A paper describes a structure:
These transporters bind the Fe3+-siderophore complex and translocate it into the periplasm. Pseudomonas aeruginosa, a serious opportunistic pathogen, does not make enterobactin but does possess a TBTD outer-membrane protein [name], related to FepA, that binds and translocates Fe3+-enterobactin into the periplasm. [name] has the same two domains (22-stranded β-barrel and N-terminal plug) common to the TBDTs.
Each of the mutant proteins was purified as described for the parent protein, and crystal structures of each were obtained. Neither G324V nor the double mutant were able to form a complex with Fe3+-enterobactin. The same titration was carried out with G324V and R480A-Q482A, in both these mutants no binding was detected. Analysis shows that for the double mutant, the lifetime of the Fe3+-enterobactin complex is reduced by four orders of magnitude compared with native (10–3.8 and 100.8 s, respectively) indicating only a transitory interaction. When the double mutant was expressed in bacteria, it was inactive in 55Fe-enterobactin binding and uptake assays.
Author numbering: 16 to 721
C-alpha cells in the first residue's frame, strides 16, 4: 500500500531529517537552531536585512528569510514570535521560535525546504521545521539529561541545561508522557564588542553594539493518550514555557541611555507560551484519519520603548515599566487518507484546517499624528490595540504509483483569508528510478504566506522625520494596509542522487519565484495634513507588495563509508541569487556558500568520536539605504570566508548511562558585531558585520535513561 503524499514527499531533495542520535552526538547549547542550521540549504540569519536585532539569529531556509520558516511541534504550528512588534525593516526584537522544546526530549526534526513544504500552507514559503517529541512506548521509560558548556573567552555566555522525561502506560487503555526542563544561556558581556564597533562620534561616542542576549527557560509538558477502541485514540496535551532574557544592551540603532545601562544583566523581556491540544486518531476499514485542535496563548511582557524620536527602539526613560502583548492562536485540522487500488495504486488525502489569530498589542499602535499631520480614516490617539485574522483551508493530495520506481504526487490547497481573500496553492512532486541506484526527483509548487497582523492593520502606524523615508528627505508615515495581497512563491527543485551501500552522492538545483513579498512602501500614496514645522504634511507610505523577487542555488551531498566503523558526510550549499527585483537589493544576507563536513568514527561498541568542519563563504550587505541611495563607507563592509571546526565523543558506560564531551570552534575563530548595516547620526554602519560568532567552547553532557 502506497504511502500518503505527506509521507512520500519527505523523500524530496529538499528534505533533511535530524535524529535524536544526531542531536546527542552534536548537542546544542540550548536553542535547537544550533543543529538545525547545519542542514543543507539552511542558514542562521538575522530577521532583517537592516541588521537591526542582528544577534538574534534564526533559521532561514534557502535565503528566504526567517519570517518564511514555519516552525511546527509534532505537526502543530508555533506562532509565538508574532506577539513581538514587526518593524519598518521587518525587524523583530525576538529570539525566534526554535527554543520552546528541550533538545534531549526531541525524537527527530524534519527540515522541509522548497516545493515539498508548500502543502503546509500559510507561512511555508521558505520551508518547514517540524520538531517531533519523543512519545510513550509499551513499557515505562524515562530519562534525565544534563548539559553544560565552558567558553574559552569569559565575555561569551555559557549555557547550562537539565531536562527529564517520563512516559509509559498508566492503565490498560491509558498512557502518559511528560517532560520538563530548566536552562540558562548567559548573555555575552556588555563590552564584548568594544574594540570592534563601527566609528561613533559626538553624542554617540562610547556606544556599543551588544553581543548575544541571554535566556532562562522553564518548560513542562504533559500528554495523556487514551485508547477508546482498537480503531480510536484520543490525546490530550498541555505545555507551559517561560523564557526570560538577560539583557546586554541591545537597542535598535545601537545607542544607549541610562535606562539601558541600568538594565544590563537583568530581565527586560519575558515570554510565556501556553499550549493546549486535543487530537483524535482513527484506524478504519477504508484507511485512516487525523483531527486536532490546538490553542496557543503567548504573552510577551517587556519594557516600554518608543516608535520614533529619541526613544525609537530603546527603553523609554519617561515611561518606565513593562507592557504585555497577547497572542491567541487557535488551529483546527482534519483529514482522511484513502488507499485506492483500481487504475494506479494510489493514496488520496483529503483535509481541511481553520486558524484564527488574535493579537492584542498596546504599544504598537500608539504613534500619534501631532508632528507629521493627521491622516483621514486614522484616529491620532487611543486606537484599538487588537487585530485578528482567520484562514479556512481545503486540500486534496494524491500519491500515485505509475510503475514501480515512479511516483507522482499532485496536490491542491485552497485558503480563504477573511480579509485578504482566496488563495490557490497547486503542488506537484515526483520521484523516478533511473537505475537501481540512481533517482531523479523534482518538484514545483506555489507556497502561500498571508500578511502578518502588523502589516495588515490600518491602525499600525510608524513615523519618521526624514531618515527612514524612501525617495525623499522630509517626514513620513508608514501605515498598515488591509487590502494587501498574500505573498506567494513558486518554488521548484530538480535533484539527482546516487545511492548504494550507504554511499550517497547527490545534487539539487532550486529556485523560488517569490511574488508580492510585503515590504515598506517606496512611493507615497497620499499626504497627511497639518503638523508642526517643516515636517508638517508628511508623506503617507503603505506596507506594499513587491512584484518579484528570486532566490536560486544548489545543494549537494556526499557521504562516503571510508571503512566499517567510519563515515564521512558532507553537504554543500551554494547561493546563486537572492534579489529583490524592484529595489535591485539583496533579499536575505546569507553566506555565499556553506560546506558542512563530518567525520564519524565508531571507535568501539561503547565509544564514538566525531570531527566536524564548516566553511562559510563571503557575506555582502544591502547596497542601498532607506532612501534608496547607494550606501558608502563602512556600510559596504563584507565578511570574509571562514571555517569553524569541532571535536566530540560519546562514551556509553552502560545501557543506562552515557556521557558526551567535546569542543566547538576549536581554532577559536571569532567575529564581533560592529553595528547595523547602515548608520544613523553619529554611528557608522557596519555592513555585513552584524553578529557575534562565539569562540572556542568546551562542553560536557550526561544522559541517564531506562
Amino acid at each position: 500500500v502506497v504511502a500518503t503524499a505527506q509521507e512520500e514527499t519527505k523523500q524530496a531533495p529538499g528534505v533533511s531529517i535530524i535524529t535524536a542520535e544526531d542531536i546527542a552526538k552534536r548537542p546544542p547549547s540550548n536553542d535547537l537552531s544550533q543543529i538545525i542550521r547545519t542542514m543543507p540549504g539552511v542558514n542562521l540569519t538575522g530577521n532583517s536585512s537592516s541588521g537591526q536585532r542582528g544577534n538574534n539569529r534564526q533559521i532561514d531556509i534557502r535565503g528566504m528569510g526567517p519570517e518564511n520558516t514555519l516552525i511546527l511541534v509534532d505537526g502543530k504550528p508555533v506562532s509565538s514570535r508574532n506577539s513581538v512588534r514587526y518593524g519598518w525593516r521587518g525587524e523583530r526584537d525576538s529570539r525566534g521560535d526554535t527554543n520552546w522544546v528541550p533538545a534531549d526530549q526531541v525524537e527527530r526534526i524534519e527540515v522541509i525546504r522548497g516545493p515539498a513544504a508548500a502543502r503546509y500552507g500559510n507561512g511555508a514559503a521558505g520551508g518547514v521545521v517540524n520538531i517531533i517529541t519523543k512519545q510513550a512506548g509499551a513499557e515505562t521509560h524515562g530519562n534525565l539529561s544534563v548539559y553544560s558548556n565552558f567558553p574559552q573567552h569569559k565575555a561569551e555566555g555559557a549555557s547550562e541545561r537539565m531536562s527529564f522525561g517520563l512516559n509509559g502506560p498508566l492503565t490498560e487503555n491509558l498512557s502518559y508522557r511528560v517532560y520538563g526542563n530548566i536552562a540558562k544561556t548567559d548573555s555575552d558581556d556588555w563590552d564584548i564588542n568594544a574594540g570592534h564597533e563601527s566609528n561613533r562620534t559626538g553624542k554617540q561616542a562610547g556606544t556599543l553594539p551588544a553581543g548575544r542576549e541571554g535566556v532562562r527557560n522553564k518548560d513542562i509538558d504533559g500528554l495523556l493518550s487514551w485508547r477508546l477502541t482498537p480503531e480510536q485514540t484520543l490525546e490530550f496535551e498541555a505545555g507551559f514555557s517561560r523564557q526570560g532574557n538577560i539583557y546586554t544592551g541591545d537597542t535598535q540603532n545601537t545607542n544607549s541611555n541610562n535606562y539601558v545601562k541600568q538594565m544590563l544583566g537583568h530581565e527586560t523581556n519575558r515570554m510565556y507560551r501556553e499550549t493546549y491540544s486535543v487530537t483524535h486518531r482513527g484506524e478504519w476499514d477504508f484507511g485512516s484519519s487525523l483531527a486536532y485542535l490546538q490553542y496557543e496563548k503567548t504573552r510577551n511582557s517587556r519594557i516600554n520603548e518608543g516608535l520614533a524620536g529619541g526613544t525609537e527602539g530603546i527603553f523609554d526613560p519617561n515611561n518606565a515599566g513593562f507592557y504585555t502583548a497577547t497572542l491567541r492562536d487557535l488551529t483546527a485540522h482534519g483529514e482522511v487518507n484513502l488507499p485506492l487500488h483500481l487504475g494506479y495504486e494510489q493514496t488520496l488525502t483529503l483535509g481541511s484546517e481553520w486558524t484564527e489569530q488574535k493579537l492584542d498589542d498596546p504599544s504598537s499602535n500608539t504613534q500619534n499624528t501631532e508632528e507629521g499631520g493627521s491622516i483621514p480614516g486614522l484616529a491620532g490617539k487611543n486606537r484599538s490595540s487588537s487585530s485578528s485574522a482567520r484562514i479556512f483551508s481545503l486540500f486534496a493530495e494524491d500519491n500515485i504509483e505509475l510503475m514501480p520506481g515512479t511516483m507522482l504526487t499532485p496536490g491542491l490547497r485552497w485558503d480563504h483569508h477573511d480579509i485578504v481573500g482566496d488563495n490557490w496553492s497547486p503542488s506537484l512532486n515526483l520521484s523516478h528510478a533511473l537505475t537501481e541506484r540512481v533517482t531523479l526527483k523534482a518538484g514545483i509548487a506555489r507556497a502561500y504566506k498571508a500578511p502578518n497582523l502588523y502589516q495588515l492593520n490600518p491602525d499600525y502606524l510608524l513615523y519618521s522625520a526624514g531618515a527612514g523615508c524612501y525617495g525623499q528627505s522630509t517626514s513620513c508615515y508608514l501605515r498598515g494596509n488591509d487590502g494587501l495581497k498574500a505573498e506567494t512563491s513558486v518554488n521548484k527543485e530538480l535533484g539527482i542522487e546516487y545511492s548504494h551501500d550507504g554511499l550517497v552522492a547527490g545534487l539539487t538545483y532550486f529556485r523560488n519565484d517569490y511574488k508580492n513579498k510585503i515590504e515598506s512602501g517606496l512611493s507615497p500614496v497620499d499626504h497627511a495634513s497639518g503638523g508642526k514645522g517643516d515636517y508638517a504634511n508628511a508623506a503617507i507610505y503603505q506596507w506594499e507588495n513587491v512584484p518579484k523577487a528570486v532566490v536560486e542555488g544548489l545543494e549537494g551531498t556526499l557521504t562516503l563509508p571510508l571503512a566499517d566503523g567510519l563515515k564521512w558526510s558532507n553537504n554543500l550549499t551554494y547561493m546563486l541569487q537572492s534579489k529583490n527585483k524592484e529595489t535591485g537589493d539583496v533579499l536575505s544576507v546569507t553566506p555565499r556558500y556553506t560546506l558542512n563536513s563530518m567525520l564519524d568514527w565508531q571507535a568501539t561498541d561503547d565509544l564514538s568520536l566525531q570531527a566536524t568542519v564548516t566553511w562559510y563563504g563571503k557575506q555582502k550587505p544591502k547596497k542601498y539605504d532607506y532612501h534608496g541611495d547607494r550606501v558608502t563607507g563602512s556600510a559596504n563592509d563584507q565578511l570574509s570566508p571562514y571555517a569553524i571546526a569541532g571535536l566530540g565523543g560519546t562514551y556509553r558506560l552502560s545501557k543506562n548511562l552515557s556521557l558526551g564531551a567535546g569542543v566547538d570552534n576549536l581554532f577559536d575563530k571569532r567575529l564581533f558585531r560592529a553595528g547595523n548595516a547602515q548608520g544613523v547620526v553619529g554611528i557608522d554602519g557596519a555592513g555585513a558585520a552584524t553578529y557575534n560568532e562565539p569562540g572556542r567552547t568546551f562542553y560536557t553532557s550526561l544522559t541517564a535513561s531506562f
